UniProtKB/Swiss-Prot annotation:
The keyword Nucleotide-binding applies. It catalyses: Cu(+)(in) + ATP + H2O = Cu(+)(out) + ADP + phosphate + H(+). This is Copper-transporting ATPase HMA4. The chain holds residues 183 to 965 of 978 of the full protein. It is found in: Vacuole membrane. Highly expressed in roots. Expressed in vascular tissues of the stele, mainly in pericycle cells. GO terms for cellular component: plasma membrane; vacuolar membrane. The keyword Transferase does not apply.
Length: 783
């Protein structure tokens, strides 16, 4: 905080004197509205203006107000990546809890499994202290009381929540199992202590080991969560905490290059980014020149060439030069901060498969308890009436002991808690591993829907275009006075600028012959005429290079005589499609328009066909151009002269046939069709505006990562289904054998000390199976 109701007690502050030492200079200096007065009420809540007269002024008032016992040094209460501190504390908590659990658990298992086999140590443990109860059970009970009563508290606290609401979950079972085992051991110890005739056996190893491994599983879950969050965080930061403040008004009078935090340099404050000073913030950069590997103003190495002054500011590390920034709004409201929030909300949200897990668990836990109860009565009543051989009973217990022993065994051999510790971690790890590639999922629902896909809707614009206008795309075949017509020659096409008219202005920039400027007249807008398809023509020159469309040609004089249809078929075949022109108010001369494609399209289409899904693309141009593009690509059904509305009806038609179809592209105007489509997956990431109407959002611009997204989704669904197959296979065999349908015919059953081990063994393997997703790699390592 420390923005509106600012409150700080920094180094040296121990009493109200230092609090007032901050106060007196902080609040008194302008930028406050003085919301009431608490008259030295410690955290006095008054208004403040952290926008203009904010961080820099407030913080430096804190320092200059101070006379040092420690000299207050700007210890603003702000999140140190509060996620980092938070999962640090959480990992610390669970790690410590598990580590103190093992401290008791490991002893007990030893003392009653391994140690008795060796002497005289077991002989010490056999020393009677009363009747037949011995030292062994005494110390075992003492050591295993903490494990449940103190450390295992969640197992009870969480269970009560579910039970009071009328439902249940994993906890419920685990708690019942361990509790029943513990009290059965207490019961068996009492019999030993009261009467020396009895010599029964105990069970505490189960109650220790099971709890220990379950806690280990929860620890692994939260470690996976921490890894995913940090993988997000490293990508979301991409900025140094401090920027160099060369203070000057707008341009000129450069005072000095300081170095302070990137919230203290807004509102006409200036960064003079030197080489290597990574671009932290936004806000118009009126001066400077730096080609750095990004899209803001350029000029050092990688040629994009924006002259000083342009409205985009963010970027990566530098090169040989500098810029002089004029921040209006720092890079803090940037999308990344709330991609963090949005993906957390998606993580907070869940998928149908997650909803599937709860429903099965809803009508499973009741069954296990009932079956465990039933198998008790079976052995008991048959035992009481003695309807089966006595010799099956092992020595040192009776039928009643066998009945309860089987009762416990079923209750501790159930679900290895896959349904609750495998799905909710696989879903999570998938998102993090995707985020490592820039691509981000929008929760599990996105995973499911993307996994169900067999069709993709592409589009040429901004998805498969580069653009290079020249004689192969934009100029004459006849003679042209004032060639090559850009600087002061061709104003005949600078009338009505749009995404294509500007290209008509820029091929002239590209082709300017060799002289600098022949400089004749540029009569822009003289006879200004606009018509759809080509709305630029006035009067100027370029052999009168006016340009026009189906209504400007025959208007001026242009008869569209046979040679233009010849140069039309010719150009369209070579994809260099012509655009109608009015050279010298005549049919002489013939413009063109063409487009290079991103050089991985063939790879992508071929490999998508390899997975076996349909590729579809639409265009707004004529049918022939789209057909030529199809010939180049090798795509299926093709559409042309299509608006985003038409894209919407085509999407609806594909879906109603029973086809889940995706679409590519981020041109925000796709929003109707983008929402209409089954999923999102917008290429060339913009901001959360894409997220508004899309679910999948791809970060980079390469078409390659589209393959990666669907591949990862397919892999995740396969892994989850395989884990469910395991959780059915183990569970369908564990229940009978433990309950006993093999003992009556072979005489083998699982004692609870070992029966619980299988439950423990599966739980680790299932989670460990899920965690292996992190070793995913690209299906196309640069094709």
């Amino acid at each position: 905080d420390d923005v509106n109701k600012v409150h700080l007690k920094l180094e040296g502050v121990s009493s109200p004197e230092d609090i007032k030492l901050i106060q007196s200079r902080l609040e008194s200096v302008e930028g406050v509205n003085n919301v009431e007065c608490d008259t030295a009420g410690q955290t006095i809540i008054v208004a403040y203006d952290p926008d203009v007269t904010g961080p820099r002024l407030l913080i430096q008032c804190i320092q200059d107000a101070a006379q040092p016992p420690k000299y207050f040094n700007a210890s603003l209460y702000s999140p140190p990546k509060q996620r980092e501190a938070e999962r640090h504390h959480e990992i610390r908590n669970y790690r410590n809890q598990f580590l103190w659990s093992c401290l008791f658990s490991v002893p007990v298992f030893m003392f009653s499994m391994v140690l008795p086999m060796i002497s005289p140590f077991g002989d010490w443990l056999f020393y009677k202290v009363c009747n037949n109860m011995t030292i062994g059970m005494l110390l075992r009970w003492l050591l295993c009381s903490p494990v449940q009563f103190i450390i295992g508290w969640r197992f009870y606290v969480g269970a009560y929540h579910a039970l009071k609401r009328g439902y249940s979950n994993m906890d419920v079972l685990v708690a019942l199992g361990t509790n029943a085992a513990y009290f059965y051991s207490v019961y068996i110890v009492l019999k030993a202590l009261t009467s020396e005739s009895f010599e029964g056996q105990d069970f505490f190893e189960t109650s220790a080991m099971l709890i220990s491994f379950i806690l280990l599983g929860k620890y692994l879950e939260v470690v996976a969560k921490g890894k995913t969050s940090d993988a997000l965080s490293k990508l979301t930061e991409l900025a140094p905490e401090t920027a160099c403040l060369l203070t000057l008004d707008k341009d000129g009078n450069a005072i000095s290059e300081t170095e302070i935090s990137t919230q203290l340099l807004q509102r006409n404050d200036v960064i003079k980014i030197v080489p290597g000073e990574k671009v932290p913030v936004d806000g118009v950069v009126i001066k400077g020149q730096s080609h750095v590997n990004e899209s803001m103003i350029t000029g050092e190495a990688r040629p994009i060439a924006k002259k000083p002054g342009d409205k985009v500011i963010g970027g990566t590390v530098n090169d040989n030069g500098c810029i002089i920034v004029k921040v209006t709004h720092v890079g803090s409201e940037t999308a990344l901060s709330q991609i963090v929030q949005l993906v957390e909300a998606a993580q907070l949200a869940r998928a149908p498969v997650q909803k599937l897990a709860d429903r099965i668990s809803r009508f499973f836990v009741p069954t296990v308890v009932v079956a465990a109860f039933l198998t008790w009565l079976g052995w008991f009543v048959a035992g009481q009436f003695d309807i089966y051989p006595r010799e099956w009973i092992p020595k040192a217990m009776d039928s009643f002991e066998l009945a309860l022993q089987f009762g416990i065994s079923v209750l501790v051999v159930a679900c290895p808690c896959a349904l609750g510790l495998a799905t909710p971690t696989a879903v999570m790890v998938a998102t993090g591993k995707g985020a490592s590639q820039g691509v981000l999922i929008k929760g599990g629902n996105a995973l499911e829907k993307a996994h169900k896909v067999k069709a993709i809707i592409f589009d040429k614009t901004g998805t498969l275009t580069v653009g290079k206008p020249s004689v192969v795309q934009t100029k004459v075949f006849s003679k042209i006075p004032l060639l090559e017509l850009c600087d002061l020659a061709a104003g005949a096409e600078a009338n009505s600028e749009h995404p294509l008219s500007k290209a008509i202005v820029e091929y002239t920039k590209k082709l300017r012959e060799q002289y600098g400027s022949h400089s004749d007249h540029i009569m822009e807008s003289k006879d200004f005429e606009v018509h759809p398809g080509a709305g630029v023509s006035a009067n100027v020159e370029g052999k009168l290079v006016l340009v026009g469309n189906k209504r400007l040609m025959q208007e001026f004089e242009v008869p569209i005589s046979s040679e233009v249809e010849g140069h039309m078929s010719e150009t369209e075949e070579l994809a260099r499609t012509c655009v109608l022109v009015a050279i010298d108010r005549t049919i002489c001369g013939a413009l063109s328009v063409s487009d290079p494609l991103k050089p991985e399209a063939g790879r992508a289409i071929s490999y998508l066909s390899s997975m076996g899904i349909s590729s579809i693309m639409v265009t707004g141009d004529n049918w022939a151009t789209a057909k030529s593009i199809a010939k180049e690509v090798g795509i299926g059904t093709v559409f042309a002269e299509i608006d985003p509305v038409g894209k919407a009806e085509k999407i609806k038609d594909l879906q109603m046939k029973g086809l889940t179809v995706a679409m590519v592209g981020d041109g925000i105007n796709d929003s109707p069709a983008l929402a209409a489509a089954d999923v999102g997956l917008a290429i060339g990431a913009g901001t959360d505006v894409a997220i508004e109407a899309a679910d999948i959002v791809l970060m980079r611009s390469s078409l390659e990562d589209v393959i990666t997204a669907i591949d990862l989704s397919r892999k995740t669904l396969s892994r989850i289904r395989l884990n469910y197959v395991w959780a059915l296979g183990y569970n369908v065999l564990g229940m009978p054998v433990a309950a006993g349908v093999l003992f009556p015919f072979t005489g083998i059953r699982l004692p609870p000390w070992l029966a619980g081990a299988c439950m423990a063994a599966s739980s680790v393997s299932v989670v460990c199976s899920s965690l292996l997703l992190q070793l995913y790699k690209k299906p196309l390592h640069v094709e």
